[PDB]
From a paper:
Structures of the selenomethionine-derivatized ([name], apo) and native, CoA-bound ([name]•CoA) complex were determined to 2.40 and 2.45 Å resolution, respectively. Both crystallized in space group P212121. The derivatized structures were solved by single-wavelength anomalous diffraction (SAD) and refined to Rwork and Rfree values of 19.5% and 22.3%, respectively. With an RMSD of 0.218 Å, binding of CoA induced only minor structural changes in the catalytic subunit compared to the apo structure. In the peptide-free [name] structures, Leu27 in the α1–α2 loop is positioned in a pocket in between helices α1 and α2. [name]-Asn147 forms a hydrogen bond with [name]-Gln106 in the apo and CoA/yArl3-bound [name] structures, but traversed a distance of 8.8 Å in the Gag-bound structure to form an intramolecular hydrogen bond with [name]-Glu120.
Numbering used by the authors:
A (entry chain C): 3 to 77
B (entry chain B): 0 to 128, 133 to 375, 382 to 728
C (entry chain A): 1 to 159
Write the structure that this text describes.
Amino acid sequence: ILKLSDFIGNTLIVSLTEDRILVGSLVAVDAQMNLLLDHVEERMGSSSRMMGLVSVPRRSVKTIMIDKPVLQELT
Amino acid sequence: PMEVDSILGSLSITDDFDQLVDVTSLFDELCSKLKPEAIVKDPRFDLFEGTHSLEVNNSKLDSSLIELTAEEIEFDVNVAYDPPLASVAAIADRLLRCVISWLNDYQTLPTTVLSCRYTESLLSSLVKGSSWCTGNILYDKVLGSCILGVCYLTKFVQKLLSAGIVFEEEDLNFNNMGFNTFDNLPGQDVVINSLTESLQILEAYSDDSLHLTMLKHILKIIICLVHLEDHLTDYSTKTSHLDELIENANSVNGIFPQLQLSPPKGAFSTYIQKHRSNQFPPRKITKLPTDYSGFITLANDVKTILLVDKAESALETYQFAKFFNKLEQRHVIARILFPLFFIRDDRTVLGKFSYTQFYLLHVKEFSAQTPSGNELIQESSNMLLEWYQNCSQNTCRYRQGFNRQLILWDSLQAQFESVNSQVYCSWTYFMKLSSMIEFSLKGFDLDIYKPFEAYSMFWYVYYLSHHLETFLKDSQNDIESNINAIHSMNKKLKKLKAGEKKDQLRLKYRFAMDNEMEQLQATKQFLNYLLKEINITKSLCLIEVFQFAILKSFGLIDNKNSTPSKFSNERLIHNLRFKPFNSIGVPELPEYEVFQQTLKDFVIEEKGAAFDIKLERATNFIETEVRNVVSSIDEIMQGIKGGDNNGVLVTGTRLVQELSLEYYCKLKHTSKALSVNSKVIVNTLKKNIKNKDSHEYKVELVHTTEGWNYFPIQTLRIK
Amino acid sequence: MEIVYKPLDIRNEEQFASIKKLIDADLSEPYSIYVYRYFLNQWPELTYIAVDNKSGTPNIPIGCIVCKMDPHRNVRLRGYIGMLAVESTYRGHGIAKKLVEIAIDKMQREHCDEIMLETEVENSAALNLYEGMGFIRMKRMFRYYLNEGDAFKLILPLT
Ligand SMILES: [Cl-]
Ligand SMILES: [Cl-]
Ligand SMILES: [Cl-]
């Protein structure tokens, strides 16, 4: 069985509404699925850049993905 | 979009992770079970850290959504835009005015120097180990040298900020967006040679145009800015490059109206905020200065810094610190430069004295007594150096620096007191009490105090000034006692006939004259100046207190908030205002009841003819004391002009003679304005009592434009 | 107009979003969702809203105040006023003053020793509102609001 508490501190892949994708460590999540991510890397096509601490609202998140080996480690 | 690398790059995004699983569904189920108030987070993590977070799809918090024009998006450094000379000159011009906007106008580095695509290009190649090839000599060689000069400048500013002299992101912004050039950026000799070589290319041009003259002056200006590091690396006091910077800035200003400049579109943009790693919200580019006058201000402020090297006494440095940054806030580069130029690498002051020698010089000139590595002296010397460094802070941090000093001076004085070292205890007391007074009056310049608080602060400073004058008067009496003791020896010698005991007295007397007399006279005349200055401060505070008491006598102001509220009381508000002085033992902070009783003795509670007679005594004092203050200021101004060798006053203002005169001139203006305003108030209020439909007035603390705003004018104004 | 001042309901999600819209309109530089979550989730009892009961939209917030409190030094509780916003159509009716009064009253009943806020030195209306309640300026911060100028640190002592 799983909880959100198991996920915090682990890198997540969050594709946004646009072609941009965010890779960051999950810091906090609230009841409305607003996420706060640290050490965020913004990937758009060829380009990549760091953006630090970013919060992503509900409407902005297209999908949430985690690495397979990391996911099994949390359990 | 259509570009090849962005297309193929989409497949490479997931390459780093071998296997990814979608967990969007699991996240929504769990979040639904959470109570609305709940947040899932690490227990150690504090939610205050998230208060400085970005937010996607928020225009004001998302730099990825910055709107750029086609020229801004497609700008290429390798294209030689036409016309080349005019475009290169326009590029260099805007970059220099970006330098001014950054340092003079306190704009951010990403929106000024880093907004240029050429500086970004050079810094990016420099990180690895001009960075663009256009095939045109103006872009590749001349403009490349310009960018290198400015990039050398910002690197030097980084070294200045590393010393921790001033406060980051307040006096000077240095968000360089993760740029670290290591040792790859060339040394000063290479940069100056590169700029000189571009100058010779411009000499070769047979045709002479205004744009060409512009570029020649810009190039020489950049050379001067690169030479600013000479004042720290070699502690040079030479003003040649600083004078050239002024001349070239003046020549460019006359050229500005004659021609029109247009940099290539997209040369300066917010592009770097959108694509380079950025942890901050996007910011628009602020309007740039229209001329090069900011370089003139920078050059003269730095020239003023180098003057302190000519100091020959502790009093000359002390008065330099009191005045060099006092009339108006100096350029931030000059304000960083002064403590680094004053307190040098080899742990010496100006390369002349050690820290303890410098401290003992202050005690000697104030007390006229020889000492005849102590921990108390080591701490006192560090305390004194921090006092000098606080002088070059901005106008707000300057007052805040005294918060730390007052309790440290007090503790230091009490520690000297416990070991019965009364000479150092005396000098520490002078510095503490002078700092208490300076800290309090500085609040009026910053408009910290509301009009109803004006009596409390002005009377407290009068109270402090009275104790300082009493202390100084006793100090000067001790000096005179020592002077008369030497004089009495000479009187006794004349009575004595030739004998062996007369040889002893002549021996004692000659040593005193050779080793003690000259310093006693200098200290006596120095204390004479301090007594005149503190009596001016004392009189001005009293004049303000009388003015307040006249206003309250007519019912126009009170020493508390006019509209009461349920939440607080006047005693708590009074104690909060005087909290900084609460832990100082000598002089004791007067109790709340003493503040109230003192005001009652000033306020005229009588009515009618009895009121009129007491009011006349108060107004006559203001007018009479203002004229006496003007006479005292005039005497000080004569002494400043005459110098320190005229036998009456010693002011030590040789290095800041013009600035100290300008200060007392402003002080004289305020004094006259206080008297004029007292007459206006009395004439207005006598007419107002007569009329039943009297006006409703409020009191405002008004700054005199050419005055000294430690003593604002308490002005009536119709509501 | 029939203005009603009530504490925040943390369970109401629409009430939450309405507060964000009000505060964001006034700000030159905005706050993230987690700025609001830092205040409202940890000090829900220190955020108040104003609603017009006789308006067409009765329960929509037309004004709000957001506050926190923490120990300062070790011995004193410092209340803090983070945000104050009043809708443009409802300005000039003393609504902001009533929101400050009800928030300070709550923080005083929570044994705050003092209330602290920052404001622009050029914000005459804010200075007049706070200093009229007993606040005094304790500090001036150089270019605290960047090109909008310096700030004053205002403190109202309660104990
Ligand atoms: Cl441009
Ligand atoms: Cl000692
Ligand atoms: Cl008082």
